[PDB]
Paper text:
The evolutionarily related deubiquitinating enzymes (DUBs) [name] and [name] comprise an identical overall domain architecture but are functionally non-redundant: [name] stabilizes c-MYC and other nuclear proteins, and [name] regulates inflammatory TRAF signaling. [name] and [name] share an identical domain structure and highly homologous catalytic domains. Active enzymes form distinctively shaped dimers, with a dimerizing insertion spatially separating independently active catalytic domains.
A C-terminal region comprising ∼340 aa of unknown structure and function, yet with high conservation, is shared by [name] and [name]. We embarked on structural studies for this domain, excluding a C-terminal peptide in [name] (aa 1,049–1,055) that facilitates an interaction with tankyrases to mediate their stabilization (Xu et al., 2017). A 1.7-Å crystal structure of [name] (748–1,048) was solved by ab initio molecular replacement (Bibby et al., 2012) and revealed an α-helical domain without any similarity to previously reported structures in the protein data bank according to DALI. C-terminally extended [name] (aa 157–1,055) was exclusively tetrameric, indicating that the C-terminal domain does not affect oligomeric behavior per se, as also found for [name].
Residue numbers in the entry: 749 to 1048
């Protein structure tokens, strides 16, 4: 469904046609599927730099690395060669009709439809998780920590869920953990700087950060005693806000602090924030790959 994929599909069909004297669409389609699978296996096998992730380029690379059933990969490839955008060109039109014909013949014994859809839903979630991560890091790099946090929280949770299904399902946990934690710490420091400002408008914004973002999401860093850097980060944030009470405070500011400080100190009763995830924009595969590369090359 892309210029790159449509042209890659036509190119592989033409290369397939040269493999046998018989040029029937049934013969060519079988050779084209074998050639395309081999092309995607090569991508799946490649050791790539951090800015490139061939799982983002094609669902079948994700399926290979995650050891999806062969018949599920085969049906996915048949759907590629049966796509209506192959319908105009003389080289691919009759192959496309043969692929559409074979898709109808597959029996539920060969491909369970719910299993097929589950695999494609995993890949959809992997792409969504990647975009949450991209936007989270793009905002982090711009020092826009509120937008960064909400997207990184979603990337982190999605990713843990994906990786519960298998090792090749998701993204580097250390990377997302680091930026989720650093984002909370930076946003907390921004809140404290505003709280100290002595300008009522800036103080109010610091308090919005604490009441709307830091206190509600603090439990996320406490869910796992094994995540020691997360636990240490929470203690550092709690220490920062208690330190104001080590000397006399102006009474109005003290009241605003102790309005939220008990909930910062013990968030065990409100582990779920019920906050809605931010919405993702629409995106192409090319855009997903380009933006992933760009943020990986811009890490700070
Ligand atoms: Na890579």
């Amino acid at each position: 469904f892309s210029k790159h994929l449509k042209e890659e599909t036509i190119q592989i069909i033409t290369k397939a046609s040269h493999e046998h004297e018989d040029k029937s669409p049934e013969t060519v389609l079988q050779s084209a599927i074998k050639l395309e699978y081999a092309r995607l296996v090569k991508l799946a096998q490649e050791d790539t730099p951090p800015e490139t992730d061939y799982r983002l380029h094609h669902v079948v690379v994700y399926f290979i690395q995650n050891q999806a059933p062969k018949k599920i990969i085969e049906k996915t490839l048949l759907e590629q060669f049966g796509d209506r955008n192959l319908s105009f060109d003389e080289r691919c039109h009759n192959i496309m009709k043969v692929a559409q014909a074979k898709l109808e013949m597959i029996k539920p014994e060969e491909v369970n439809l719910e299993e097929y859809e589950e695999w494609h839903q995993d890949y959809r979630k992997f792409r969504e998780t990647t975009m949450y991560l991209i936007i989270g890091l793009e905002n982090f790099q711009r020092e826009s920590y509120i937008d960064s946090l909400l997207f990184l929280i979603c990337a982190y949770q999605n990713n843990k869920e994906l990786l519960s299904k298998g090792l090749y399902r998701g993204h580097d946990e250390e990377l997302i953990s680091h930026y989720r934690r650093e984002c909370l710490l930076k946003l907390n420091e921004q809140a404290a700087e505003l709280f100290e400002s002595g300008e009522d408008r800036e103080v109010n914004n610091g308090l919005i950060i604490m009441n709307e973002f830091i206190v509600p999401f603090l439990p996320l860093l406490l869910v796992d005693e094994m995540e020691e850097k997360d636990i240490l980060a929470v203690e550092d944030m709690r220490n920062r806000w208690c330190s104001y009470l080590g000397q006399e405070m102006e009474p109005h500011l003290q009241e605003k602090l102790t309005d939220f400080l008990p909930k910062l100190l013990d968030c065990s009763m409100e582990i779920k924030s019920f906050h809605e995830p931010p919405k993702l924009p629409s995106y192409s595969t090319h855009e997903l790959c380009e933006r992933f590369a760009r943020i990986m090359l811009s890490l700070s």
